[PDB]
Specification:
BAT3 protein; structural genomics, unknown function; Ubiquitin-like (UB roll); three-stranded mixed sheet; Large proline-rich protein BAG6; ubiquitin-like domain; globular
Amino acid sequence: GSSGSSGLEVLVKTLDSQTRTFIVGAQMNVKEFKEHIAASVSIPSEKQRLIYQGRVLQDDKKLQEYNVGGKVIHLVERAPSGPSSG
């Protein structure tokens, strides 16, 4: 889905060199975004924690606000992630 080139791009680099571009509404908030990618990343927001410039992106805050458009954010997963995984 997702038609027309209208939206803000947001990348996410996990702790395994894995950048994933995401197109969400600039209006969207950090939290929401987490819930959105939460699907792809497969990680829950409450577990997620977008970090940029060594700072923890606020939930109430929005991506645009930070200006992470086409930028690479650093998402972290709570608890010690498993090596094998699956």
